[PDB]
């Protein structure tokens, strides 16, 4: 019965694919060589930087590194706004609240700590510590000041109420370790890429898996939503980036090259969704035309593996972290 | 800088926050990070408890702040968090010499760990504990039950040297070095052994970094 259902799903996928995205997109000019240069360099982190996140004001960012420090940077003036010590230095993810009052972090401690940025005592203190994940914490994103969704290596994703401190929902169905998650613009759905080489779309209100995507060959390490909200891109450990679609429910575009043989650590989109930025293990970061299969630029300012990457909400800058303990802002 | 408040913000960033960052970096370079690996009931817990998610254990022996990270509680995929322990000084691997199924499992695990790409230049301090139990068991049973190709004597020293040579056969990197040690439950100089081992590893790191090759 499961095989028959899978065959029906494959037939439904093949019935819709009348025109490939590469064929239709040939009628427009490419973006050409995207010339982007380093503007700032943040030089406070000592050990390898593993995760970073932007604030919604497009001026403040939070970065997490192996030296057990959450540092908030002023991107315009290079000044450090805050330095938050972490109880566990094995942090693999960090988040910025949309309001700007909170930051979160987590890692191999199996704990998603939440810190309060705007207190009355003038110092940043830890607000809540969320527990319940058996595996390591790999990604966390705020829905609001009270709701946060996390992904873990115990093949589950959860939704928490920060005030209550307990999981509202648990998302189950992955067989491998969940590595990353990305929220929709409306914060009503999210996609999680797992170590079973599959991506699953979830419903936060319903709590059940809606669609599954099985394009990649190795474990997916990074996922990101298209700005429109009905598409997303994945980055896996087979030197491949792929673009899926929620409505079509199948692979749409593939972003790989013969000279690229290393895994992808991070992915990100631009404001219009025309540029797909991906960090690699070539110590670089390759800019991809999303509508085409052609590379458009290289962010070669790092001498170590690029671990994190993101674009501001106004789209005016791109910050890349790496294992060389530096963050660079590119315009 | 063009404004008084901007001047005070720059002063804060460059005078307080960077001061704490520098002090933390100074205090964080005194420690020694060691990865602890082994099997279940292999003495890995009983040696770290004798010296004393993720289990972090730390102690100071000779003005060195050792930090043993017992990752055995992680039931997830090993190939997803093994890169976190890249900058460890060494790896402490514990092997039980009592039984044979876990012996072959430890051979496979040591082969997997030794030839990992993140640990090509990382030395290994290999512990073969429960030597008293191994000798007491081997005085009445042979090692041919474990290794069918064993042709040496069924004596304690010859058998134990055969197992030690079996583990070091998994090393194919000239730069890497395995510091084998024979220990028991009542053994107490384990901290000293780790101290000399990490001292040697640091010497080899200085040789590599000084451009002397």
């Amino acid at each position: 019965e499961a095989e028959q259902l899978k065959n029906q799903i494959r037939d439904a996928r093949k019935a819709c694919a009348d025109a490939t995205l590469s064929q239709i997109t040939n009628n427009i000019d490419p973006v050409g060589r995207i010339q982007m240069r380093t503007r700032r360099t943040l030089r406070g982190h000592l050990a390898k930087i593993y995760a970073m996140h932007w604030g919604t004001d497009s001026r403040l960012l939070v970065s997490a590194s192996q030296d057990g420090k959450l540092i908030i940077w002023d991107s315009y003036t290079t000044n450090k706004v805050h330095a938050i010590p972490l109880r566990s230095s094995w942090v693999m993810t960090c988040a910025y609240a949309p309001s700007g009052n909170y930051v979160a972090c987590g890692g191999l401690d199996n704990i998603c700590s939440i810190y309060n940025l705007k207190t009355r005592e003038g110092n940043v203190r830890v607000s809540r510590e969320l527990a319940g994940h058996t595996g390591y914490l790999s990604c966390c994103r705020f829905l609001d000041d009270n709701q946060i969704v996390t992904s873990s290596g115990d093949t589950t994703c959860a939704l928490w109420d920060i005030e209550t401190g307990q999981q509202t929902t648990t998302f189950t169905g992955h067989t491998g370790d969940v590595m990353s998650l990305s929220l929709a613009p409306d914060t009503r759905l999210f996609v999680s890429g797992a170590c079973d080489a599959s991506a699953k779309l979830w419903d936060v209100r319903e709590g059940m898996c809606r669609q599954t995507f099985t394009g990649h060959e190795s474990d997916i390490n990074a996922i990101c939503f298209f700005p429109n909200g009905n598409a997303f891109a994945t980055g896996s450990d087979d030197a491949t980036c792929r673009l899926f679609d929620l409505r079509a429910d199948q692979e749409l575009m593939t972003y790989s090259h013969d000279n690229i043989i290393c895994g992808i650590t991070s992915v990100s989109f631009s404001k219009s969704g025309r540029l797909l930025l991906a960090g690699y293990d070539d110590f670089n970061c390759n800019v991809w035309d999303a509508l085409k299969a052609d590379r458009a630029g290289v962010l070669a300012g790092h001498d170590n593996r690029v671990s994190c990457l993101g674009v501001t909400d106004d789209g005016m800058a791109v910050a890349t972290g790496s294992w060389d303990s530096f963050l660079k802002i590119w315009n | 800088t063009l404004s008084a408040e901007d001047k005070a913000a720059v002063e804060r960033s460059k005078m307080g926050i960077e001061k704490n960052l520098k002090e933390d970096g100074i205090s964080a370079a005194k420690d020694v990070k060691l990865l602890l690996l082994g099997a279940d009931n292999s003495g890995k817990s009983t040696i770290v408890k004798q010296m004393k998610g993720i289990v972090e254990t730390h102690f100071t022996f000779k003005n060195l702040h050792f930090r043993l990270f017992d990752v055995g509680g992680q039931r997830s995929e090993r190939k997803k968090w093994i890169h976190c322990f890249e900058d460890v000084t060494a790896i402490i691997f514990c092997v039980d010499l009592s039984d044979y199924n876990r012996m072959h499992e430890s051979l496979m695990d040591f082969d997997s760990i030794c030839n990992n790409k993140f640990f090509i230049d990382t030395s290994i301090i290999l512990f073969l504990n429960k030597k008293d139990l191994f000798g007491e068991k081997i005085k009445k049973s042979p090692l041919t039950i474990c290794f069918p190709e064993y042709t040496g004597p069924n004596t304690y020293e010859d058998a134990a040297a055969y197992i030690q040579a079996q583990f070091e056969s998994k090393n194919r990197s000239p730069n890497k070095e395995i510091y084998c040690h024979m220990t028991c439950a009542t053994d107490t100089n384990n901290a000293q052994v780790i101290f000399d081992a990490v001292t040697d590893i640091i010497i080899a790191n200085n040789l590599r970094g000084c451009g002397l090759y």
Partner: single-chain antibody
Amino acid sequence: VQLVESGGGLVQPGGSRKLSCSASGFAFSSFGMHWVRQAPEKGLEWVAYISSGSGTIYYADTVKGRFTISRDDPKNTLFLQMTSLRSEDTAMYYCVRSIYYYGSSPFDFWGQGTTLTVSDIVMTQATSSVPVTPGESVSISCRSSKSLLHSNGNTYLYWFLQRPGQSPQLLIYRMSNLASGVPDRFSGSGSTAFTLTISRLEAEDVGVYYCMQHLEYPLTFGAGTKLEL
């Protein structure tokens, strides 16, 4: 948060006294500190400033050399040593905390000042006394000689409301920036002629309103604008 001062009393001319500030409930070391003076003529005047970590120090144009401001963070105490006190030094001095980073609210908390007895960019507040009608919205304006709109977009006009027999309260730190704990009925706007508007005025907001500037190290307060019900 609690700033408490002491060491205020009668001082003979030519004498000396020291002022101490006791702080609790907040991270003292991360905060820069201020000393603000108010003569019995209902006029606020800034005295001295010390930065976080005892770095930058500023003094008023009328107390430089005579006064000294010092602090010790482990004891959470802020000092002000004044020597050769004059008759113009007969006033009550406040202890004000002020932290400085991107998006912070400086001059947020004011202490309970202790009176002392001894026997630029000018701010204009032409309106002095205004009849306050409860339940009716009012407006309070201020004026400046030099424009406070800096090149980085920050216009440094501060609003303080002094309740009768009480310390000033930071209503608004920068223009159109409502502070913490202040009800939403207040609003600030302007450019340079600035204005503070209180839509749907209620009771318990009767007092003297002051405008302040933070553009330049010479720091100037406004004249006392008073709302009398």
